[PDB]
Amino acid sequence: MAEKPKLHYFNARGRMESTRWLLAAAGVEFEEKFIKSAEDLDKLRNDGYLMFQQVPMVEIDGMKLVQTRAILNYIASKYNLYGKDIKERALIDMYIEGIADLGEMILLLPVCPPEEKDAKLALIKEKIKNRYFPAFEKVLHHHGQDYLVGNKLSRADIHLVELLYYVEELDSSLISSFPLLKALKTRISNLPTVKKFLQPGSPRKPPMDE
Amino acid sequence: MAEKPKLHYFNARGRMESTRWLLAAAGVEFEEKFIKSAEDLDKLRNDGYLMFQQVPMVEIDGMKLVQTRAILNYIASKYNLYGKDIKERALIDMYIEGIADLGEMILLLPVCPPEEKDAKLALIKEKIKNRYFPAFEKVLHHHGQDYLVGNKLSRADIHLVELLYYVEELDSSLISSFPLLKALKTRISNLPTVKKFLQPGSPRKPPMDEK
């Protein structure tokens, strides 16, 4: 009756990559079904597989889940990565929605024309240095613990470290004045499930033009 | 301590209105502290009240919560409006993230120039009639029950009916072919907590072209 979740998306990062990270960190093997044409997406739509006619969609535990946050919230709860109580979940949600805001800026960074790419990249770097990285460094500095919330691995650590890898692709110097973020990146990357995902041949997807 | 949540935002709907709806529907009295100037927002920032230097912020249960979804998820769980288990939450989350997508289109609808307002409104109406309203009408039709999930009031019913009022403001005819959505709107609007919120004098905020 099927055990591997099935990920319906493109052979690309896009809006599915944070789900790939979370499942891989939880040690969950999954299947991917790549959209490669208009007819592939039209088939999913006509078959009634997409509640709002869009992907990402994940087949898991008998459901056809769409909307990235619905998918991620279910996976996080199922694999005990969403905190131990609703107050831990509140901190996790606050942290990861800030991460989502920065991640969306990076996802939608224009490539063309060059003067627009340059202008938007400059603003993103300002926000990374002055808003987002200080906020997360401060959480880690305030409790001195190895993880963001509850002194235990959660999805917040996984989502943040994923973002740290994208920020490194934009500008490797941006993390340099944030030693607790660098230490978190190292600690999470050394977890055996995450280290496997970082190896060649994993489902981790490459950048578009980096 | 401080039994009433405190909502920090502008005296406007914006990104705080769905929290006002949810707290009011849950029967929870709250306080508001309105940002009326740049100085107000700067004071919140320099006092360390805003994790990412932005509002909405809600003071609740000893936390200074920012990010609308963090605020709403916590309130929904605290007041037992988030279903009974992980699978019900998956359905709720699916539904309300679709609601959030349509709500965002409406929130960001331009007013100017008129031909652009008209063009993007025409796109929103086509998605309401062809994508979003059919999807929620099918949910109610499939199980035949009074509420979206679990045969019991949840945040999904509250968030959907809120959005039904905004769609009504855009075009009162868009719901006409969706009888189950109309019946849900009437049912939720007649719940005593929601009916009270719909009265003049409640914390419900007006549309911007009126304030």
Residue numbers in the entry:
A (entry chain D): 1 to 210
B (entry chain C): 1 to 211
What text appears in the publication on this structure?
Glutathione transferases (GSTs) are promiscuous enzymes whose main function is the detoxification of electrophilic compounds. Cytosolic GSTs are dimeric enzymes with each subunit having two distinct domains: a conserved N-terminal thioredoxin-like α/β domain and a C-terminal α-helical domain.
The improvement in the catalytic activity of hGSTA1-K141H/S142H as well as its thermal stability prompt us to investigate the structure of this mutant at the atomic level using X-ray crystallography. The mutant was crystallized in two crystal forms with four molecules (1.56 Å resolution) and two molecules (1.87 Å), respectively, in the crystallographic asymmetric unit. The engineered amino acids are at the surface of the enzyme. The results showed that the mutant hGSTA1-K141H/S142H exhibits higher catalytic efficiency, thermal stability, and sensitivity against α-endosulfan compared to the wild-type enzyme. The double mutation K141H/S142H, according to the crystallographic analysis, results in subtle but specific changes in the protein structure, and the observed stability may be attributed to specific interactions within an amino acid network.
